[PDB]
Amino acid sequence: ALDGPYTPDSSNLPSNYWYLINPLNDGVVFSVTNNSTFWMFTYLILPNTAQTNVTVNVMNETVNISIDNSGSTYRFVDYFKTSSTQSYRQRNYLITEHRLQAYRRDESGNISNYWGSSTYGDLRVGTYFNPVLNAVINLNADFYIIPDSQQEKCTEYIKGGL
Ligand SMILES: CC(=O)N[C@H]1[C@H](O[C@H]2[C@@H](O)[C@@H](CO)O[C@@H](O[C@H]3[C@H](O)[C@@H](O)[C@H](O)O[C@@H]3CO)[C@@H]2O)O[C@H](CO)[C@@H](O)[C@@H]1O[C@@H]1O[C@H](CO)[C@H](O)[C@H](O)[C@H]1O
């Protein structure tokens, strides 16, 4: 149906596709930096994860972050900073039954992904207005590719699983 799966890869990805990651493992599943004003990664957290300080190696830095997930399903949590020496801070999250999240970089270089919760009723695509034109995107997960004209198909997978 879908093009894929492909093994984990880093590349300066094009803008006319959604990248549907299907991470086998928790932890860092996605990252991108422009090396100057924006660093972003997504951490997949298991259900019933009490608040924990964890050390992670991401985009060539060893950093410490807080993670938590008191829910009964998976939680993909976005972390960002806007300068080299800042600490990472949490942004949006996706609550989901499935090991699936999806990313797209728009033509202005902004990262979009899925936020919210299908079960709660506020699942949405949200865009972080922090351009990273030509930045290498690290997909730390097996993934599939979906043409940008087919966002509804991507949403279907995010909601329902593969
Ligand atoms: C107020 C509300 O709707 N709370 C929801 C909660 O919704 C948040 C999530 O969608 C997260 C995902 O990242 O985004 C939050 O909105 C962000 C927005 O995306 C940012 O751009 C903006 O800068 O900040 C806002 C605020 O941080 C949403 O607010 O999602 C949870 C989990 O599904 C819901 O349970 C929660 O609903 C509330 O649940 C409460 C008890 O658990 C109460 O029932 C309350 O009445 C519900 O509204």
Author numbering: 64 to 225
Reported in the publication:
For rotaviruses (RVs), which are the major causative agents of life-threatening gastroenteritis in children under the age of 5 years and result in 453,000 deaths worldwide annually, recognition of specific cellular glycans for initial cell attachment is mediated by the distally located VP8* domain of the spike protein VP4. Although structurally conserved with a galectin-like fold, sequence-wise VP8* is the least conserved among RV structural proteins contributing to a phylogeny consisting of 37 [P] genotypes9. Our crystallographic analyses provide the structural basis to explain the unique glycan specificity exhibited by a neonate-specific bovine-human reassortant RV strain and its parental bovine strain, each belonging to the P genotype. We have shown that P VP8* exhibits a novel glycan-binding site that adapts to a differential recognition of precursor glycans, which are the core elements of HBGA and human/bovine milk glycans.
To investigate how P HRV VP8* can also bind to Galβ-GlcNAc motif with β1,3 linkage, we determined the structure of P HRV VP8* in complex with LNT to a resolution of 1.5 Å. The residues N155, Y156, W178, G179 and D185, which provide hydrophobic interactions with the terminal Galβ1,4-GlcNAc moieties of LNnT, now interact with the reducing end Galβ1,4-Glc of LNT sharing a common set of hydrogen bond and hydrophobic interactions. The non-reducing terminal Galβ1,3-GlcNAc of LNT, because of the shift, makes a new set of hydrophobic interactions involving I158, S180 and Y183. Comparison of the unliganded and LNT-bound P VP8* structures also showed that ligand binding induces significant changes. The R154 side chain that pairs with the aromatic side chain of F143 via a cation–π interaction in the unliganded structure, upon LNT binding, swings around to interact with the Gal3 residue, through a water-mediated hydrogen bond, and the side chain of F143 rotates accordingly to maintain the cation–π interaction. The side chain of S180 that hydrogen bonds with the main chain NH of Y183 in the unliganded structure reorients upon LNT binding to interact with the GlcNAc moiety through a water-mediated hydrogen bond interaction. A significant change that is observed in the LNT-bound structure is with respect to Y183 in the J-K loop. The side chain of Y183 is rotated to create a hydrophobic pocket to stabilize the terminal Galβ1,3-GlcNAc of LNT. Without this side chain reorientation, Y183 would clash with the GlcNAc residue.
